[PDB]
Amino acid sequence: MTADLKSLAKRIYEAYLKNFNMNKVKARVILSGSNNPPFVIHDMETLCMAEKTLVAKLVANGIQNKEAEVRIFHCCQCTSVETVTELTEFAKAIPGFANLDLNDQVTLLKYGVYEAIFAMLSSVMNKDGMLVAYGNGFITREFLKSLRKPFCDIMEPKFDFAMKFNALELDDSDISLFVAAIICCGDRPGLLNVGHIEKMQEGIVHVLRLHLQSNHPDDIFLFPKLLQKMADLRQLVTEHAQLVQIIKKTESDAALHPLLQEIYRDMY
Numbered sequence: 001m002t003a004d005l006k007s008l009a010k011r012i013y014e015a016y017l018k019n020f021n022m023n024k025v026k027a028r029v030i031l032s033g034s035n036n037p038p039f040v041i042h043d044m045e046t047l048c049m050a051e052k053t054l055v056a057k058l059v060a061n062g063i064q065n066k067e068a069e070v071r072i073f074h075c076c077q078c079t080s081v082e083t084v085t086e087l088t089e090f091a092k093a094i095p096g097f098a099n100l101d102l103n104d105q106v107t108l109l110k111y112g113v114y115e116a117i118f119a120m121l122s123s124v125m126n127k128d129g130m131l132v133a134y135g136n137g138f139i140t141r142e143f144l145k146s147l148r149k150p151f152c153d154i155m156e157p158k159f160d161f162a163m164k165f166n167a168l169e170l171d172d173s174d175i176s177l178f179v180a181a182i183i184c185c186g187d188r189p190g191l192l193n194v195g196h197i198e199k200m201q202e203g204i205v206h207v208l209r210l211h212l213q214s215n216h217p218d219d220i221f222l223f224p225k226l227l228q229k230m231a232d233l234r235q236l237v238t239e240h241a242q243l244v245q246i247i248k249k250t251e252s253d254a255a256l257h258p259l260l261q262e263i264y265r266d267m268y
């Protein structure tokens, strides 16, 4: 007559496999190297080729097409909007989340989505580049660094986080619970029912702790390593939001999608 934490871990894992278009196994199959392989974007010529095949509407404007860096930033935003949608459905699997007031669900998602986005982005990154466009492109790290300022400054800190995060050798069963724990933080600004959220957090962190003990017997500090990664992600998001605001203030063509503007509004 006690909670079955192994079963809860498996429920979370299954919800992650159901709700995210990309997972670490799917990404590794593509990254390893037969139908619809990814188109490699390593320079301006190959960016423009990939756009004409994969996001044709975006470059169908002739002289009116936006600057390459702004088109890339638009594609970044579309990826975030999609991952926010996936995370919102995933959160229903977290015990207690759907029982919270709607406003608290919104606040938890507001602060958690970008931390989760950058954690999961590691799964599609290697030291040379990253998968994009639903696994149909591979854009190089060097190409992103070559963009004009400020756009070359977006992805590099995310690659740096990801190289260390990937060295932990988590699998999707671990990442799903880490993402659930990110969403359940009782210290987000403006929460109403802090007490119930703290209990929700305690519960999911307990599931995570036991799962890591079982799945990674070789790494006895993996749980505190991941607690630190959560703090690192909060700081990565704070810095990312500051850069997005610079882009907003200084780049008139880099229209910010209204869902993301709402996420960033009053965030940090």
Ligand SMILES: CCCCCCCCCCCCCCCCCC(=O)O
Residues within 6 Å of the ligand: 050, 051, 054, 055, 072, 073, 075, 076, 077, 079, 080, 081, 132, 133, 137, 139, 154, 244, 260
């Ligand atoms: C076919 C053309 C492909 C162009 C691919 C551009 C790269 C996509 C990167 C996806 C990850 C974006 C992470 C940064 C998010 C920045 C925007 C935001 O704040 O939501």
